[PDB]
PDB file of C-alpha atoms in Angstrom:
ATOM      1  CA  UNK A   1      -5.659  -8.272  -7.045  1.00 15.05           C
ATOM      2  CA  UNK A   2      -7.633  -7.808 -10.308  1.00 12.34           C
ATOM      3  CA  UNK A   3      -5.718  -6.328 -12.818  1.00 12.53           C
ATOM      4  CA  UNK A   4      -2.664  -3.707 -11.735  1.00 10.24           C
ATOM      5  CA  UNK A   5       0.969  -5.302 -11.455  1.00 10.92           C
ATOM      6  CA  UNK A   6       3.176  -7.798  -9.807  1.00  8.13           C
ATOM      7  CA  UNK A   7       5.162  -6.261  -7.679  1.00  5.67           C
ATOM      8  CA  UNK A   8       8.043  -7.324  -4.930  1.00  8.43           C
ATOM      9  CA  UNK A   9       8.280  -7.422  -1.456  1.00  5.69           C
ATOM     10  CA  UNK A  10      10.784  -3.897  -1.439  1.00  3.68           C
ATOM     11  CA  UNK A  11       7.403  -1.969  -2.913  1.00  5.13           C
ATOM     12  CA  UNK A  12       5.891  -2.850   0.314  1.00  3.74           C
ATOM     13  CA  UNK A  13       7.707  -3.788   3.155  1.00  2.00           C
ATOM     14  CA  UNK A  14       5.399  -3.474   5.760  1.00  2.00           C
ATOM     15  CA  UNK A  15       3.234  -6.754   4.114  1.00  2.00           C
ATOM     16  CA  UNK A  16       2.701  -9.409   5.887  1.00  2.00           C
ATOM     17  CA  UNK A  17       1.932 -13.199   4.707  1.00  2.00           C
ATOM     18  CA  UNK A  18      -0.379 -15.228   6.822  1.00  2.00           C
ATOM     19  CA  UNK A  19      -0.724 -18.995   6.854  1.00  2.00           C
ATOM     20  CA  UNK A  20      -2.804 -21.418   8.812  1.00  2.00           C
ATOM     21  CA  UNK A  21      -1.158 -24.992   9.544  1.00  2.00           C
ATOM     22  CA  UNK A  22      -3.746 -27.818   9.297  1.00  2.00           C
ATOM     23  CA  UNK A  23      -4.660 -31.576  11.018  1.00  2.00           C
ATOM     24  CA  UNK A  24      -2.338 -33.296   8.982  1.00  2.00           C
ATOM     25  CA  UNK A  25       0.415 -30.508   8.376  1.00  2.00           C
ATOM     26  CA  UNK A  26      -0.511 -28.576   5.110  1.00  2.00           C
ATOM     27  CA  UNK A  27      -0.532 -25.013   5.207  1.00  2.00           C
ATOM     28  CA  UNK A  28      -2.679 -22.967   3.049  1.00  2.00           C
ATOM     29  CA  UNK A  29      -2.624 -18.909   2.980  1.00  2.00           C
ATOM     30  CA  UNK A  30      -5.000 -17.228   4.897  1.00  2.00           C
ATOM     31  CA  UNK A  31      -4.898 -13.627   4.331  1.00  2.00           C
ATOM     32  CA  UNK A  32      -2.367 -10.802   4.317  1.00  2.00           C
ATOM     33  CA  UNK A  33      -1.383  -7.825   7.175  1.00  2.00           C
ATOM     34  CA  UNK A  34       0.784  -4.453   8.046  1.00  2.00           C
ATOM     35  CA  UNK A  35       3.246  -4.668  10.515  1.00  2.00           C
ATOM     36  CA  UNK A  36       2.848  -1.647  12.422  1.00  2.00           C
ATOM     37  CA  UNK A  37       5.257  -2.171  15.094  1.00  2.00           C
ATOM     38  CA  UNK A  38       8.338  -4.633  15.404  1.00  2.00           C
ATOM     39  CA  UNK A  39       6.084  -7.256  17.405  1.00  2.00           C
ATOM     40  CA  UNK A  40       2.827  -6.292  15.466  1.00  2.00           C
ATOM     41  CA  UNK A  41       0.502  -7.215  12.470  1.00  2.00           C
ATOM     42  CA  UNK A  42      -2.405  -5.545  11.489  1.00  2.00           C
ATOM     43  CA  UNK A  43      -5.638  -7.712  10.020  1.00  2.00           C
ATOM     44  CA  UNK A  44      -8.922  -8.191   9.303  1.00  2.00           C
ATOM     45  CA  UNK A  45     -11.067 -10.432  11.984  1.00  2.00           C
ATOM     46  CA  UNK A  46     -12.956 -12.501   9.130  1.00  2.00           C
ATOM     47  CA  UNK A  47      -9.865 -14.116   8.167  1.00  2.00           C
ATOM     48  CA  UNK A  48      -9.512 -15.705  11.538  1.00  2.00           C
ATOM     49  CA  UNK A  49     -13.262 -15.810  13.245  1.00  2.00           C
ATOM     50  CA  UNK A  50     -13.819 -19.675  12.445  1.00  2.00           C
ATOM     51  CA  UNK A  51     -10.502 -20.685  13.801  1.00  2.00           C
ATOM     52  CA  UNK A  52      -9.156 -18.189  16.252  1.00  2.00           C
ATOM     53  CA  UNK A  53      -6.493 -20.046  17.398  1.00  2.00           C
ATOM     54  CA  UNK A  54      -3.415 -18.470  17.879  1.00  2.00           C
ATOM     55  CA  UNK A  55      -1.300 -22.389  17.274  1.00  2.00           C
ATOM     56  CA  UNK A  56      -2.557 -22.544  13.872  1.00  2.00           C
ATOM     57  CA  UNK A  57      -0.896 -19.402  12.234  1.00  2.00           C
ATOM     58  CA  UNK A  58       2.340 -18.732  10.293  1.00  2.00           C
ATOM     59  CA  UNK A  59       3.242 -15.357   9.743  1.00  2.00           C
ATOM     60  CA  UNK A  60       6.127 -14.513   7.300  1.00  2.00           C
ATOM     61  CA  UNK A  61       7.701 -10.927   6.538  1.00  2.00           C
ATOM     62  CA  UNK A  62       9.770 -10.021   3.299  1.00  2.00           C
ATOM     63  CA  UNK A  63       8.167 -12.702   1.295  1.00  2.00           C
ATOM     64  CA  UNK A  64       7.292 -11.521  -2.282  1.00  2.00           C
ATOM     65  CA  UNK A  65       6.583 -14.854  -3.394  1.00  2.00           C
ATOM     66  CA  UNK A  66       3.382 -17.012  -1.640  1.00  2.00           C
ATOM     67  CA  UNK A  67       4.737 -20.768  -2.278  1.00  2.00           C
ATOM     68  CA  UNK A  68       9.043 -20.439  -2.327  1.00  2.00           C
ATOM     69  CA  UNK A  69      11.213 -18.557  -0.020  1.00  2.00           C
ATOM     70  CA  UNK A  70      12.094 -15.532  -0.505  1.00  2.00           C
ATOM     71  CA  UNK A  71      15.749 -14.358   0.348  1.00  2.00           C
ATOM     72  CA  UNK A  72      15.860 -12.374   3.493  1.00  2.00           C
ATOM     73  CA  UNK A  73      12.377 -13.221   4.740  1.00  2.00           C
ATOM     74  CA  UNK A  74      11.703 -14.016   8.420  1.00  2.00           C
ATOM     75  CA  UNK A  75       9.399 -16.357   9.552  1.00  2.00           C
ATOM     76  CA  UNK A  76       7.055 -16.031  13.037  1.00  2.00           C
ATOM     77  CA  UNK A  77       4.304 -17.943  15.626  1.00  2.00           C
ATOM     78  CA  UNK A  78       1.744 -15.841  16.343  1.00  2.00           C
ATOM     79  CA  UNK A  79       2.472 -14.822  19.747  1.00  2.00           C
ATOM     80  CA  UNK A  80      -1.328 -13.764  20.936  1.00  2.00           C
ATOM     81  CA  UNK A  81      -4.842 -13.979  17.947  1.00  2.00           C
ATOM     82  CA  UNK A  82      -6.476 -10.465  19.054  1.00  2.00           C
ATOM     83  CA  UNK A  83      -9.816 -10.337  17.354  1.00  2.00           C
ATOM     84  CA  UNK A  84     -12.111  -6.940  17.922  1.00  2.00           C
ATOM     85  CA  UNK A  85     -14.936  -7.787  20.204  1.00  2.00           C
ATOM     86  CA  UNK A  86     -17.764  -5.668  18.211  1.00  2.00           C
ATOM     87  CA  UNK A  87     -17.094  -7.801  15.178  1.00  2.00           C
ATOM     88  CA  UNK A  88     -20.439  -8.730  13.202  1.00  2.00           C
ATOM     89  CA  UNK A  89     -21.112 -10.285   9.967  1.00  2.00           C
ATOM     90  CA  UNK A  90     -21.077 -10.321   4.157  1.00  2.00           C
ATOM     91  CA  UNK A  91     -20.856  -6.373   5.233  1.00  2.00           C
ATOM     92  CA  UNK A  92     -18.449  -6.662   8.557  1.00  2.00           C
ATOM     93  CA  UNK A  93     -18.075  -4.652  10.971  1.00  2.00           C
ATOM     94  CA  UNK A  94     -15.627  -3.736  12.887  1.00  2.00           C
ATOM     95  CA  UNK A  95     -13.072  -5.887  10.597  1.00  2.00           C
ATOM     96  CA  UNK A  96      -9.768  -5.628  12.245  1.00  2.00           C
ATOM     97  CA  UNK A  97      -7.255  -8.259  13.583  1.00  2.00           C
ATOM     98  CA  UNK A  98      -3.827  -7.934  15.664  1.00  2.00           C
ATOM     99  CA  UNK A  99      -1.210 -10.516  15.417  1.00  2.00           C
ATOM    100  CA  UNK A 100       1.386 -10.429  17.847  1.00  2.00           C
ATOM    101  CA  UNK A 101       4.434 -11.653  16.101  1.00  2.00           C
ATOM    102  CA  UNK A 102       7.453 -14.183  17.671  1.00  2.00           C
ATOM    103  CA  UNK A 103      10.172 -16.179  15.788  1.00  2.00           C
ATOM    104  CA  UNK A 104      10.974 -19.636  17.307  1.00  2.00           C
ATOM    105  CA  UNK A 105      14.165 -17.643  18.686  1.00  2.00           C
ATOM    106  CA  UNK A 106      12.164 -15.269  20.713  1.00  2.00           C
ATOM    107  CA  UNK A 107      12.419 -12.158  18.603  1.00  2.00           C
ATOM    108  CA  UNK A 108      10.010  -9.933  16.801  1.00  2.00           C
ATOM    109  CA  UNK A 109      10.465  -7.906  13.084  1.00  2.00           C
ATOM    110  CA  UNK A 110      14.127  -6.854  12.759  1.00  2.00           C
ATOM    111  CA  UNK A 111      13.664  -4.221  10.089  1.00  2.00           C
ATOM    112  CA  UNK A 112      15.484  -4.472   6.366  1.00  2.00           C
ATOM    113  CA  UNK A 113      15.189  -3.832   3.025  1.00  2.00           C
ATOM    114  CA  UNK A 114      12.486  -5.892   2.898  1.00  2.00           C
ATOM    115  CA  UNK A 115      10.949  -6.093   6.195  1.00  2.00           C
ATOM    116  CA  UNK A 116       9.487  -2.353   7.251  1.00  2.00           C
ATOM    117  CA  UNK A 117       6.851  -0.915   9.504  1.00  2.00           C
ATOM    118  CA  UNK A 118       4.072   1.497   8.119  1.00  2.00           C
ATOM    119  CA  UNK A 119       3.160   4.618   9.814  1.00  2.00           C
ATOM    120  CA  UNK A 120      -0.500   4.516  11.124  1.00  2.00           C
ATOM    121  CA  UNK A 121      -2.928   7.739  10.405  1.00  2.00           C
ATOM    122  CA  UNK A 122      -3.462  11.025  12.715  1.00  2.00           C
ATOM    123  CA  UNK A 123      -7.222  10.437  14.298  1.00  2.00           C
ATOM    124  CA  UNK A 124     -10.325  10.451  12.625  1.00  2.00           C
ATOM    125  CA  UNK A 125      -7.639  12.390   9.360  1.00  2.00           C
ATOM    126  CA  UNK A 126      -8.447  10.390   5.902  1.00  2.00           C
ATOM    127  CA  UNK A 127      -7.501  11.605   2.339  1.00  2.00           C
ATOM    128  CA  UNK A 128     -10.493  13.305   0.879  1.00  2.00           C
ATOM    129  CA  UNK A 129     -12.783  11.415  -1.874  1.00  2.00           C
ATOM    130  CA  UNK A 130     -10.845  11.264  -5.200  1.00  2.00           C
ATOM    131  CA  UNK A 131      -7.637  10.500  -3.734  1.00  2.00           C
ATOM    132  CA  UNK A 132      -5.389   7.772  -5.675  1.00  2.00           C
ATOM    133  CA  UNK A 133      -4.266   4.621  -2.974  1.00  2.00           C
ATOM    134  CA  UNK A 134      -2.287   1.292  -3.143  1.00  2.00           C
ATOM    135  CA  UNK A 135      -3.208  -2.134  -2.336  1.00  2.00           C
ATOM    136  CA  UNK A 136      -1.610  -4.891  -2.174  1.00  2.00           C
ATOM    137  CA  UNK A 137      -1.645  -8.848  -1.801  1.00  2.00           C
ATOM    138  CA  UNK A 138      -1.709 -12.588  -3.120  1.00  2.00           C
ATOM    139  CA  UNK A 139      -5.170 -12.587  -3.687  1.00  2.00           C
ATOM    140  CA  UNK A 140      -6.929 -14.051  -6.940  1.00  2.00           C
ATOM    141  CA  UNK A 141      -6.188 -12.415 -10.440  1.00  2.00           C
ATOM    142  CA  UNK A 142      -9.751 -13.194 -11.946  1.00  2.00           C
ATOM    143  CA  UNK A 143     -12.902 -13.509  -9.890  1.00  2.00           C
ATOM    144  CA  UNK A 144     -13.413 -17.156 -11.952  1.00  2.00           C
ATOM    145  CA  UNK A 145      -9.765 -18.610 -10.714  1.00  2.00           C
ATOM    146  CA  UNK A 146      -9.206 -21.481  -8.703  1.00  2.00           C
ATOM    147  CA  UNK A 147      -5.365 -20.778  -7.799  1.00  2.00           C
ATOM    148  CA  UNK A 148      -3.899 -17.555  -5.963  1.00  2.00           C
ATOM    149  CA  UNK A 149      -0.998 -15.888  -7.913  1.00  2.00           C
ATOM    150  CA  UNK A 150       2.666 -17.110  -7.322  1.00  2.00           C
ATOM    151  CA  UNK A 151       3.887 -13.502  -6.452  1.00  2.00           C
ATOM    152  CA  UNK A 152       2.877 -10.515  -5.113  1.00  2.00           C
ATOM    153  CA  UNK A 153       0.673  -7.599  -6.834  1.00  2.00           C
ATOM    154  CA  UNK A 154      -0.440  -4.225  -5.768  1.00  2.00           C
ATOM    155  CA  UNK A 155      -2.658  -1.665  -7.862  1.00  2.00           C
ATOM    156  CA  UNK A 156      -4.184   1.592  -7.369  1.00  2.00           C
ATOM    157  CA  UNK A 157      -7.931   2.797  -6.715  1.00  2.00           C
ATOM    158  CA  UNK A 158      -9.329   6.408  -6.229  1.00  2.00           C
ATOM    159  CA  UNK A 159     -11.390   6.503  -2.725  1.00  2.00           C
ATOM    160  CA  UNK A 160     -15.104   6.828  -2.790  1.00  2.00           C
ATOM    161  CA  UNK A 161     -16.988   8.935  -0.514  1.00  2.00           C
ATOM    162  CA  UNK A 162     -19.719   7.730   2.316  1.00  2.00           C
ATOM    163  CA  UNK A 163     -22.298   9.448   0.144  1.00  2.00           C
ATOM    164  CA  UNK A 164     -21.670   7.724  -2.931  1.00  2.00           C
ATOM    165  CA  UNK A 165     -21.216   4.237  -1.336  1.00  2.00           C
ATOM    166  CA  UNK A 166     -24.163   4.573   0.617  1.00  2.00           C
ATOM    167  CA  UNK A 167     -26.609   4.697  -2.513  1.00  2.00           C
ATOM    168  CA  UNK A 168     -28.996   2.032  -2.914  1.00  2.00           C
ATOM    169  CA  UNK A 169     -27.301   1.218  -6.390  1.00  2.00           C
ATOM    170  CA  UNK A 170     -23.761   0.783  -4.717  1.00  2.00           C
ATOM    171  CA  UNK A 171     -24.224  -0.836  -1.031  1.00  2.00           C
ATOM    172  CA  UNK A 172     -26.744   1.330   0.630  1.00  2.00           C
ATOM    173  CA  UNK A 173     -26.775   0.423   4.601  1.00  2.00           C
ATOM    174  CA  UNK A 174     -24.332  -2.202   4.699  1.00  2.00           C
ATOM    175  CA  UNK A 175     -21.650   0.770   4.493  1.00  2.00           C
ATOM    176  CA  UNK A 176     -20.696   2.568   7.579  1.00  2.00           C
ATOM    177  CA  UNK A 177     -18.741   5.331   8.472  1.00  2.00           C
ATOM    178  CA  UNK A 178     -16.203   3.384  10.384  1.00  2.00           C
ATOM    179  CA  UNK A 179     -15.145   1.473   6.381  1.00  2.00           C
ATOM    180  CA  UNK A 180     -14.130   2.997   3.148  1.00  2.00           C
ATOM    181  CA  UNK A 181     -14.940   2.653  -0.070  1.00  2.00           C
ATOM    182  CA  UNK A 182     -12.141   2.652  -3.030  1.00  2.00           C
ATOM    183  CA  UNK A 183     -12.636   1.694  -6.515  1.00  2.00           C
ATOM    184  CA  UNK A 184     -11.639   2.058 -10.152  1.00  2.00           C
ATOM    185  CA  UNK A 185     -13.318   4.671 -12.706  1.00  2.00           C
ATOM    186  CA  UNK A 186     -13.407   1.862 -15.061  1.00  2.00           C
ATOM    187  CA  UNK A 187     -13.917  -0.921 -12.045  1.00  2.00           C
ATOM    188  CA  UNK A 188     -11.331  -2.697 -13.908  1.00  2.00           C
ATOM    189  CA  UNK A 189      -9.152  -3.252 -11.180  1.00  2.00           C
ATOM    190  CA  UNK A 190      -9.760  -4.370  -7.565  1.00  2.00           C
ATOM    191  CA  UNK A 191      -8.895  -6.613  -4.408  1.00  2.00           C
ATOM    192  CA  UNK A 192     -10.107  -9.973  -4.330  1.00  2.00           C
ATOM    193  CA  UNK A 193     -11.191 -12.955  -2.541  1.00  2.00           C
ATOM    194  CA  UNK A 194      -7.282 -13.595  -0.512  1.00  2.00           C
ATOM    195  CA  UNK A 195      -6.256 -10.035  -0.507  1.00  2.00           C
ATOM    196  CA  UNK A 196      -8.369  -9.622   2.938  1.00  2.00           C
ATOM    197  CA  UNK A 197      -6.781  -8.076   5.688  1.00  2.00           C
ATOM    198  CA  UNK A 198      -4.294  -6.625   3.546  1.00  2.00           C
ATOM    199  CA  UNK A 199      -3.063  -2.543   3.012  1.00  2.00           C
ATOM    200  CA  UNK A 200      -4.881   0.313   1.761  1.00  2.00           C
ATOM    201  CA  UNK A 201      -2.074   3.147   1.535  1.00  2.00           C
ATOM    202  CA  UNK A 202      -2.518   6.927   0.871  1.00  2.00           C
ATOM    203  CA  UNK A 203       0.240   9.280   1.025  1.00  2.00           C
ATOM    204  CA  UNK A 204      -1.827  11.530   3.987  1.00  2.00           C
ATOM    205  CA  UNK A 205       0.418  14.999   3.826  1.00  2.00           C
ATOM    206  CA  UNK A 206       3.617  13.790   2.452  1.00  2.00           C
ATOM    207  CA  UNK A 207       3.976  10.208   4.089  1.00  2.00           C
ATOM    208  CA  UNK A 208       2.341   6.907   3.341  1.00  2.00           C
ATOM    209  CA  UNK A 209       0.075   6.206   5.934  1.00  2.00           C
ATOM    210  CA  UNK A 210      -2.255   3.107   6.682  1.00  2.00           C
ATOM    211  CA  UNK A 211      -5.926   4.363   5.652  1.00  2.00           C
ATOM    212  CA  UNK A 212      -7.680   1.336   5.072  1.00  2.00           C
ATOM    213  CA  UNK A 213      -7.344  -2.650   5.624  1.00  2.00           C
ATOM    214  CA  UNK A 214      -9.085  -5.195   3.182  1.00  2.00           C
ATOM    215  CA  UNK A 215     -12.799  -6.292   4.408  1.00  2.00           C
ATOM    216  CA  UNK A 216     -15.103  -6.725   1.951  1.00  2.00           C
ATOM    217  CA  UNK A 217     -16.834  -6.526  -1.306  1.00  2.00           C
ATOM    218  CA  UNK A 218     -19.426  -7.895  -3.416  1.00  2.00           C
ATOM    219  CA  UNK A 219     -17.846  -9.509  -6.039  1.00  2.00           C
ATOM    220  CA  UNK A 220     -14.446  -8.530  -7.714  1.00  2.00           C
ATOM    221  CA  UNK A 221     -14.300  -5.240 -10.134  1.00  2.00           C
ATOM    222  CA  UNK A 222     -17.910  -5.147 -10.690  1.00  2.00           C
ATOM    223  CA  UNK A 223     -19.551  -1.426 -11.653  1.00  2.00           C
ATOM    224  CA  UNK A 224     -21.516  -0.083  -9.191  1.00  2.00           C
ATOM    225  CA  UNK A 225     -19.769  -2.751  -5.859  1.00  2.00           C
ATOM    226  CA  UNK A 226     -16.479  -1.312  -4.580  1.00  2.00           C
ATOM    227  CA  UNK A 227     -13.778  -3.022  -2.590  1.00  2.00           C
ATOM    228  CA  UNK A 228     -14.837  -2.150   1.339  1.00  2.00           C
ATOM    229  CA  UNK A 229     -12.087  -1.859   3.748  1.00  2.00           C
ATOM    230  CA  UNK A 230     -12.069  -0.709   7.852  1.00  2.00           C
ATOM    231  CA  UNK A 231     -11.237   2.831   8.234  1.00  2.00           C
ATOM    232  CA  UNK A 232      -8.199   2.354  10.690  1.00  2.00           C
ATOM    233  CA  UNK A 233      -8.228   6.393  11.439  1.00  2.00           C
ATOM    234  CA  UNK A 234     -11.249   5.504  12.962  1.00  2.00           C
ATOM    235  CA  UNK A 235      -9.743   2.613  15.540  1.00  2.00           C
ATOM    236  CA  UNK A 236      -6.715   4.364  17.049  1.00  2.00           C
ATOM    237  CA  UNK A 237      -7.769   3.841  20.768  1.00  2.00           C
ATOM    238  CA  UNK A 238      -8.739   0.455  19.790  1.00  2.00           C
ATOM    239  CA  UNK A 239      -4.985  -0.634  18.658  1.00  2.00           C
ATOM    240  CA  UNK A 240      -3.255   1.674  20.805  1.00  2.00           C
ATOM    241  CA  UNK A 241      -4.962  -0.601  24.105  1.00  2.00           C
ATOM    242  CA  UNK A 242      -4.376  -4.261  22.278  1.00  2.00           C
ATOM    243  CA  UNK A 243      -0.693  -3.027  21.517  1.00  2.00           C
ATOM    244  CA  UNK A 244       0.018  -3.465  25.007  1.00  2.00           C
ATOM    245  CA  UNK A 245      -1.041  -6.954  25.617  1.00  2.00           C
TER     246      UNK A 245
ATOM    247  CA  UNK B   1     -20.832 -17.581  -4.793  1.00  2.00           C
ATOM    248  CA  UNK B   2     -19.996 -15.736  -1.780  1.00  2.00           C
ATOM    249  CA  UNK B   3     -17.204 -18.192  -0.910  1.00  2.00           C
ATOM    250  CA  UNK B   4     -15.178 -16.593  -3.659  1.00  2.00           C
ATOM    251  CA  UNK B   5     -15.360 -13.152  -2.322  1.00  2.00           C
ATOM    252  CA  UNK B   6     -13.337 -11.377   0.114  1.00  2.00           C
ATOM    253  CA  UNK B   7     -14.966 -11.146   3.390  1.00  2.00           C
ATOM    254  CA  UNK B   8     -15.447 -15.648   3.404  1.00  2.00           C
ATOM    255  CA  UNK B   9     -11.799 -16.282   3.135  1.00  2.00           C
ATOM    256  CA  UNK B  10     -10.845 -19.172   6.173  1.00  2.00           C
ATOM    257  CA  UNK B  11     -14.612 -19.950   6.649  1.00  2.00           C
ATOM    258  CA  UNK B  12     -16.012 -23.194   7.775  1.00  2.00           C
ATOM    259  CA  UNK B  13     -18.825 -23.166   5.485  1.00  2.00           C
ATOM    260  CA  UNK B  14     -15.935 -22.364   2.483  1.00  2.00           C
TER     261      UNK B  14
END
């Protein structure tokens, strides 16, 4: 996240922190995720195309802090690596993940004050253009850093509409209608590279709701390139099928 | 480079 504020785990409960284990036995983060349901994670499919092994993955929930432990925080084996089968690819499409999540004890999220599902949208039912969201996630502080930031951070961008983002001085073609575009007036703030597969909230007619999940984006707060993240009101049938597996 | 922007993270090539 460029610019907003750190943040803790409570702000966000839903977030989820996932690690890949390598040859050798490091483990490096990968990208973040919603848990949905008690046995489910929501993600992006570019964070996992190039090794979609279910073995390799950590995922950890109520973890504000990307390298220590935080107090409370559960860790899980990814139980089954569901990537979407339409998936293309720096504009993707079709950019969503499921994790199904079990500890080493059998069980799935035992919710907390830390550990939280997040509702998903009604169907094809998206803020309109304008509207203020969160994100949130580890990713990198400064487009030019090497290292991720210790602890979490969310911030807030205003959604763009299809029209605008679809102008040959923004991203033209590479925009569909199944992702949406959010940005800063001042494009001083924004996801970054790490913050993938992470949360895009609105508050859709009182409750917070999960519009949007990290994709893509030339770049990191530049004018004129917003962050691009899959329109999840626009998947419904797709997770409501893969939920069951 | 494009290896530094969300979309690459957990690539081969990065």
């Amino acid at each position: 996240i460029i610019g907003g504020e750190f943040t803790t785990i409570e702000n966000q409960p839903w977030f989820a922190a996932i690690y890949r284990r390598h040859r050798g036995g490091s483990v490096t983060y990968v990208c973040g995720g919603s848990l949905i349901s008690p046995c489910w994670v929501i993600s992006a499919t570019h964070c996992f195309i190039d090794y979609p092994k279910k073995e390799d993955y950590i995922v950890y929930l109520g973890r504000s802090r990307l390298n220590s432990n935080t107090q409370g925080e559960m860790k899980f084996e990814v139980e089954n690596l569901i990537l979407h089968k339409d998936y293309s690819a720096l504009a993707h499409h079709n950019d969503i993940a499921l994790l199904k999540i079990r500890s080493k004890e059998g069980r799935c999220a035992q919710p907390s004050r830390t550990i939280q599902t997040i509702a998903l949208p009604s169907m094809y039912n998206d803020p309109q253009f304008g509207t203020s969201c969160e994100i949130t996630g580890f990713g990198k502080e400064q487009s030019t850093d090497y290292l991720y930031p210790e602890q979490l951070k969310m911030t807030v961008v205003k959604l763009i509409s299809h029209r605008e983002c679809q102008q040959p001085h923004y991203y033209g073609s590479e925009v569909t209608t199944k992702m949406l575009c959010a940005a800063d007036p001042q494009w001083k703030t924004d996801s970054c590279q790490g913050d993938s597969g992470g949360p895009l909230v609105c508050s859709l007619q009182g409750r917070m709701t999960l519009t949007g999940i990290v994709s893509w984006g030339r770049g990191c707060a530049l004018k004129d390139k917003p962050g691009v993240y899959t329109r999840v009101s626009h998947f419904l049938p797709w997770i409501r099928s893969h939920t069951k597996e | 480079g494009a290896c530094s922007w969300r979309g690459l993270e957990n690539h081969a090539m990065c």
